[PDB]
Ligand binder design. Structure first.
Ligand SMILES: Nc1nc2c(ncn2[C@@H]2O[C@H](COP(=O)(O)OP(=O)(O)O)[C@@H](O)[C@H]2O)c(=O)[nH]1
Ligand SMILES: [Mg+2]
Length: 179
């Protein structure tokens, strides 16, 4: 099989680890979620090509901020994430994540991923955002951001319901294979 490396980045609590867990174990972690990952090589077949895709999870706060640059060498594809229930997390895409990834991973394809799509029509989420005069991120807003940052594409998923998860990783593998 062809060996490729994926790195996932984005604001704390935007659903990175749960996304990796759901693709790998086919089960949303209902109780315990480790800070990261670590060490899962996905077997993915796309367009008649068997790929081993190493999943490198990352985190924030002092220690994991310090360590995060060590994830970047020899990356073939980046999943850059925000949460659909967090306009703040989308704002950090151009402010923080894009400059960081462009510095360490020039020319590496980026898939921009909107996580927690299940929260888009969630009553509690709507109500909490409405008191801020905010609303969940719209798909067109995600797409606009992907265009702006020069991403390979924009995708949405819910780790919680599993919807769109398989497709995120299939598209990431296609990006890792090219060029
Ligand atoms: N509603 C919803 N919650 C999610 C989803 N994915 C993760 N979460 C929750 O979001 C929180 C952070 O998830 P985690 O994967 O640890 O985020 P990370 O810090 O980006 O790795 C946890 O409480 C998860 O249960 C999702 O798709 N939908
Ligand atoms: Mg995590």
């Amino acid at each position: 099989a062809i060996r490729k490396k994926l790195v996932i980045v984005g604001d704390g609590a935007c659903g990175k680890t749960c996304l990796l867990i759901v693709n790998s174990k086919d089960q949303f972690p209902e109780v315990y979620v480790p800070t990261v990952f670590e060490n899962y090589v996905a077997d993915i077949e796309v367009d008649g090509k068997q790929v081993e895709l190493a999943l490198w999870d990352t985190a924030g706060q002092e220690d994991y901020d310090r360590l995060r640059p060590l994830s970047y060498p020899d990356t073939d594809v980046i999943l850059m994430c925000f949460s659909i229930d967090s306009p703040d997390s989308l704002e950090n895409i151009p402010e923080k994540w894009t400059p960081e990834v462009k510095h360490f991973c020039p020319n590496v394809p980026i898939i921009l991923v909107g996580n927690k799509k299940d929260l888009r029509n969630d009553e509690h989420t709507r109500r909490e955002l409405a008191k801020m005069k905010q609303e969940p991120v719209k798909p067109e807003e995600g797409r606009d951001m992907a265009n702006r940052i020069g991403a390979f594409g924009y995708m949405e998923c819910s780790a919680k319901t599993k919807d769109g998860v398989r497709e995120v990783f299939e598209m990431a593998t296609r990006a890792a294979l090219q060029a």
